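RECORD TYPE: protein structure
NAME: PbtD
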Amino acid sequence: GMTWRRFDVAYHDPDLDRLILAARPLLSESPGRSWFQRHWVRGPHLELWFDHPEPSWERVREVLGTHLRAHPSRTRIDPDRLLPQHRRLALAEQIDEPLLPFYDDNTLHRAVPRSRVHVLGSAAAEDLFHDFHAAASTAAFDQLDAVVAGESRLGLAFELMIAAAHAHAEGGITGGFVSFRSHAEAFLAGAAGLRERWEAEYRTRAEALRAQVAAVVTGTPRGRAWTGLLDGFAGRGDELIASGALTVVLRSPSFRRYRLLLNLTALQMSRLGVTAVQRSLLCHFAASAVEEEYGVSAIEIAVGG
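PREDICTED:
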């Protein structure tokens, strides 16, 4: 917190995948824990977090300098309409920090790490997330090779969601149902007319989605890699929800674990460039595919008595 460095790479092109990829050597060079995330404070930007002195500002400035100059971002923005969205997002995410001015495109800034303690629960909670972000930043680089190499971004994300529910939900995949239906019903309560669209988008892909669910449930290299990564944080997470040092079958200790590991997965989806809408769509896709593939209703009714 007095050790963490943060660098903000201002970039208004929503596609960051190639920029992120350029920055990979920096994190490999870093002897400590390093990580990155997409963020919006003072406009779209990439954030590079390092808890050790190396690489170093001038290293960072030269690596990202090359790329930024070679591959600039031509995208404009609307500061006038964007500011209100952020001022709301600041209240939502609970973000005290200069929202103004906006960074100019294609600029490297040095910046102070923000604290997430008042949001996460403890200092211990904050450390756990740093650890996860570090591990998941590594795994993000691989997943983004694939994506730039043409692969489905949304398809990779769905895979992580399904794998996580199967490994870590009480009762495997059918036990992640409610959490999927939850995330998605939340979004649709906030915009009625999308319900029907979400339904039509599932319907044309129904058997295709189910086939992916089944495939991930059986086991895939990517699926086992992700759940493995999450493994590392399950034990430590338990303690912190047990001890009360981490954000609140409400009281259920093994429902709390899962909700956390599902949030970590969601953060991975941000990192990979899956927006709130796409994330809402995947959750709907997941809830419906799981329903139809396993007759989750038949089951809920069955265990009714």
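COMMENT: Residues 117-302 form one domain.
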